[PDB]
Design a protein around this ligand. Structure first.
Ligand SMILES: [Cl-]
Ligand SMILES: [Cl-]
Ligand code: NA
Ligand code: NA
Ligand code: NA
Ligand code: NA
Lengths: 29, 57, 33, 51
């Protein structure tokens, strides 16, 4: 996969992104 | 809780790291097996050639 | 363990993950400060 | 703020890692097929010698 075409991989990356962006926006409050 | 927050973040990253390793390990598993079976064929051929020449000698 | 090429035994892979983590940890300390 | 940019950076890294790994597996597979083909040759001869 050249841009990453694997749905399992992208799912793992998106979840991490989602979880981290939430923790950070819970640390600034 | 800047220290409690950092621990949570790191546990989460530690998860992700083990998870991405499993993902890559499984992605290339068939190549790792191909190498193993063919490397087995080379052993078998090497256990026939070395037996004939020795016998031949 | 059957192969020395395998990702689980690959120090390049570990380096890349370790670096992501190191960066994220440094980055997030900056965002809080 | 967000970490999107870090992850986008990590995705390119992971793609370069995978390509690299594909190469490493490819060469090793070809190297062993060659060293495999040339074993059937020596066997093909040592059998045809005795005919
Ligand atoms: Cl890339
Ligand atoms: Cl890069
Ligand atoms: Na948002
Ligand atoms: Na660690
Ligand atoms: Na990184
Ligand atoms: Na961009």
């Amino acid at each position: 996969l050249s841009p990453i075409n694997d749905p399992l991989l992208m799912s793992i990356l998106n979840r991490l992104q989602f979880n981290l962006n939430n923790d950070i926006q819970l640390k600034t409050e």
